[PDB]
Design a protein around this ligand. Structure first.
Ligand SMILES: Cc1cn([C@H]2C[C@H](O)[C@@H](COP(=O)(O)O)O2)c(=O)[nH]c1=O
Ligand SMILES: Cc1cn([C@H]2C[C@H](O)[C@@H](COP(=O)(O)O)O2)c(=O)[nH]c1=O
Lengths: 202, 199
């Protein structure tokens, strides 16, 4: 069994990548594609309070992500792993570390401690990081709305802090981290990602 | 100026009725507000609802939801009131989590205390009234309002849990004998609070 997570800032093409990678693997392996809360009832309710998020304490936000993470992990990830499946997970602990910890400013280690209580030490066997530059990310983001409003000074600077945050987390731990160049065209990002995962599975 | 006073106690301690009457006595001489989590806080209420409805919910998830609701309530209601110099009477706070999720549920008091430290950011109560009722008295008052055995044994673990938390911090803690008739528990509780606000 293998618990593989995918992390990356906005505009890294993560969602389309994980989707195509999964379609390639589904044939040769017993692989499931998932994302938090991933259909978990309680997890879904918890997550709904967040996206319809109107300036809720960042600490509350952090905790809700942690709580949703827990439900999903226990009710969906762990069971799958016990059945010997390969679990492809769109975002995990690292997302919280980068977004709530670094970008939001709560403090990476403080948020990592919160999540340790949630994941009980169950870290990913492998974590693919789609390393896209802020500029490339920004371009992918605008082509998906083509009317830049949701993209202003702060929005753009926040997206930079996130990347900075990832750079920090990836720096300390590179044991479970395997990076990929998300600055390339998406077809190449997928191939590279696929290869990285096949190697690990061999 | 302001005082953050919490009330803790197991089931059947008469806590709710106590805080209510104590509050009515203070409302006259002090600028006091009576609250409970989530205390009408929108986000807090939504979070609490999930606890209310959920069945066999993972205890750690439960603990985190209580912590998340605690945060909203603290920041959107308690802190603001304290900055306005009010006396805040709060029905249950961090200690409830330590006793129920930490001790009784078995997650571990310190592990749950750490979770909540992230939530309250070190904002502990100025005073915490503990309604010390025995399991047996609690059982009776409860039977008097409304159920089983391992539920009766859980009620005991909670009390045990409270016993543990109490004599590790008798700085905030001020105990009251909830085994007495409710009228007496209220008087004692009121006096303990007036002494603290007077000194
Ligand atoms: C899982 C997770 C997501 N997020 C955010 C970042 C993403 O913009 C969003 C989920 O978007 P996505 O479905 O496109 O990956 O939620 C956090 O801030 N912290 C977390 O722990
Ligand atoms: C505030 C809080 C309550 N509880 C429980 C115990 C009580 O039975 C219930 C609230 O009931 P009450 O309003 O009568 O005090 O929720 C916890 O388990 N943890 C907490 O942190």
């Amino acid at each position: 069994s293998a618990f593989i997570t995918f992390e990356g800032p906005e505009g890294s093409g993560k969602t389309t990548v994980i989707n195509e990678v999964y379609h390639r693997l589904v044939k040769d392996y017993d692989v499931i594609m998932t994302r938090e809360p991933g259909g978990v009832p309680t997890g879904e309710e918890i997550r709904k309070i967040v996206l319809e998020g109107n300036d809720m304490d960042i600490r509350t936000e952090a905790m809700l992500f942690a709580a949703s993470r827990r439900e999903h992990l226990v009710l969906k990830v762990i069971p799958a792993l016990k059945e010997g499946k390969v679990v492809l997970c769109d975002r995990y602990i690292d997302s919280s570390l980068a977004y709530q910890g670094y970008a939001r400013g709560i403090g990476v280690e403080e948020v990592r401690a919160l999540n340790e209580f949630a994941i009980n030490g169950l870290y990913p066997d492998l974590t693919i990081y789609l390393n896209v530059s802020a500029e490339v990310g920004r371009e992918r983001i605008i082509k998906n709305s083509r009317d830049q409003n949701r993209l202003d000074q702060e929005d753009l600077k926040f997206h930079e802090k996130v990347i900075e945050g990832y750079q920090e987390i990836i720096h300390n731990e590179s044991q479970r981290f395997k990076s990929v160049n998300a600055d390339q065209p998406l077809e190449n990002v997928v191939e590279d990602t696929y290869q990285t995962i096949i190697k690990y599975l061999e």
